[PDB]
Design a protein around this nucleic acid. Structure first.
Lengths: 213, 13, 160, 53, 53, 53
RNA sequence: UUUUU
RNA sequence: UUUUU
RNA sequence: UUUUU
RNA sequence: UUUUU
RNA sequence: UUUUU
C-alpha cells in the first residue's frame, strides 16, 4: 500500500531506495546551510577579517560557547587566548546575524565541540562551565554538557537522558511571551481645538448659559 | 596563524 | 513531483507534522540543500497535515527499517521522546497510523509517546475577537458656539 | 490587494538577512517567524494559520 | 563532520589541537583582564597610593 | 542617522570606564549592559535584540 | 465597515 | 508620523 | 476527531 | 520550533 | 549574565 492520487502513485520508489540523507542535514533543530553561510559571511564582514585568520576566530568562538552558553541574550564581548593575552571581540555580530537562533547556528559545531572536550579531558579535568552550572556529578559525561549539543541517533542513551534532564532543569518553567509593550505611546487624542484672545480661559471659549443671580 | 585584533568602530559600517 | 514527495516524507519522519510548522523544509540533492516553503504543505492540508501524511505511514515505516540496515537511524521524533529501544525505530514518528497489524508492544510504545508529547495541552476554541471597537461612535456635532470641545453650553450654572 | 505578494516578499527577504517589517517592530513582536504577517494591511484569509491569525 | 561554508571548512584543526586556554580565562562569570586592570588603576589613583604599598 | 555610530561609541566608552548616557540615568535604567541603547534618538532595527527593544 | 503611520 | 532636553 | 514541530 | 548566558 | 553585604 503506497500513496496514490487519481490512481497514479505519489511517491517514487527508485529515488526513495537511493535517498539516504544525513539526519542532521534534514533536521529542523539546526540552521540550514544557507543560513549558516549568511551568518558566516556577516560575521566575517563585520569583523573586517580575511579568509586566512577567520578559522582561528571560529576556533575561539566555539570554545568560548562550549563554556558560557549560546543564549540570545548574551552581550558584551567574548575572549580568545593569544598565548597569555586576552583578545576581546564584540558579541553583536555573532548574535544579531544568527538565524533562526545562535543555538541553531552553533549546533553545526557540535561534533567538533564534543571531540574538543574529550581531547581537553585527557591532560586535565575539563568540565565545561555549563556542566558546572547544571551541577553534573559525572565527569565522564563532560563531552555532552554544553547547551548547543545536538542529539543524534549515535548519542548513547545515558548521554541523551543526561542532556534532556539538563535542558529541563535549565529551562524550568520559563513562560514564553509573544509580545512586549506596544510602541504606540500616544493613548489620547490630538487637541485640534483653537485658542483665541476672546477666550475666557485656555480650556474654555465662553460661559454661555451661566447666569449670575 | 596569529589571532587578529579588531577595532572598536570599524570604518566598514 | 514524486521526488519532492519522497523528500517531504523523509523530512517529516524526522521533524514532525504539527500544524504550527513554518519556514522551509529541505531536500538532499547529492550534497546540496534544496529548500521548499512549508506554506503550501500545511495550508492546503485538510483536515490536518498529520491526517494527510498518515497516508505515507506504511512507506515511512518501510523506509525507516531500510535505513536501519546500514546505520543507526532513529527518527528525531524518537529522540525527542527519549525512546530507549532502537528496534522500535520504525514506529517512532508522529504521523504513524496504528492498524490491526501493528504489534502490541509497538502500539503501547506509540500510545505512550503520544501521551507524553501531548501532555495536558488545553484546547481553546476561540482566540481574541477581531472586533476591536468597544466604544460607541460619537455622532455629536461640534460648533463654534460651543464653550468647550466636550460641552455645548453651561445651562443651569449660576455664578454666585 | 498586495497582501499575498507582500507576505511572499517578506518571507523572501527573511532568507538573506533578518527582515522584520517596522510595523512588527513597533508592535514589539517577539517572534521572527511571524515576520511575514506583521504589516497593517495584512488580509486574513481561510489559509492563514491560527497562530498567525 | 566539521562545519563548512561554501565547501571550505570553517574551523582550523591545527590551531584547535593546540588551543588549550585556562577555563577561568575564557569564563563569562569573571571580569576580563582589561576590566581588572582598569579597576585596579582606578582604585590605585583614587587612594593616592603608590605601587609599593 | 547617527544611531549605529552612537551605539558603537557608547560600547567603546564602556570599555575603559562606566559610561551610561545621561538619558539612561534620567530614565533610571538599572542595567549597565543596556547602556548602548539608552539614548532618545536610538533607531530600532530588525537586528536590535528583543530585550533592548 | 472605519480607526493600526 | 510628532511629543523623550 | 483535534492538540505530538 | 523557540525559551538553557 | 545580574541579584549572595
Amino acid at each position: 500500500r503506497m500513496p496514490k492520487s487519481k490512481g497514479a502513485t505519489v511517491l517514487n520508489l527508485e529515488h526513495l531506495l537511493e535517498y539516504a540523507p544525513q539526519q542532521i542535514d534534514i533536521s529542523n533543530t539546526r540552521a540550514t546551510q544557507s543560513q549558516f553561510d549568511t551568518w558566516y559571511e556577516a560575521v566575517q564582514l563585520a569583523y573586517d577579517i580575511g579568509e586566512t585568520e577567520m578559522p582561528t576566530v571560529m576556533n575561539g568562538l566555539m570554545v568560548w560557547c562550549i563554556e558560557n552558553g549560546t543564549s540570545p541574550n548574551i552581550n558584551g564581548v567574548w575572549v580568545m587566548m593569544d598565548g597569555d593575552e586576552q583578545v576581546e571581540y564584540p558579541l553583536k555580530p555573532i548574535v544579531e546575524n544568527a538565524k533562526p537562533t545562535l543555538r541553531q547556528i552553533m549546533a553545526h559545531f557540535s561534533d567538533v565541540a564534543e571531540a574538543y572536550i574529550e581531547m581537553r579531558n585527557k591532560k586535565e579535568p575539563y568540565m565545561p562551565r555549563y556542566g558546572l552550572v547544571r551541577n553534573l556529578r559525572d565527569g565522564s559525561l563532560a563531552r555532552y554538557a554544553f547547551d548547543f549539543y545536538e542529539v543524534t541517533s549515535r548519542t548513547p542513551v545515558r548521554a541523551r537522558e543526561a542532556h534532556i534532564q539538563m535542558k529541563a532543569a535549565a529551562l524550568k518553567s520559563a513562560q514564553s511571551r509573544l509580545f512586549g509593550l506596544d510602541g504606540g505611546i500616544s493613548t489620547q487624542e490630538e487637541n485640534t481645538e483653537r485658542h483665541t484672545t476672546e477666550d475666557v480661559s485656555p480650556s474654555m471659549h465662553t460661559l454661555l448659559g451661566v447666569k449670575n443671580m | 596563524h596569529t589571532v587578529p585584533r579588531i577595532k572598536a568602530i570599524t570604518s566598514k559600517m
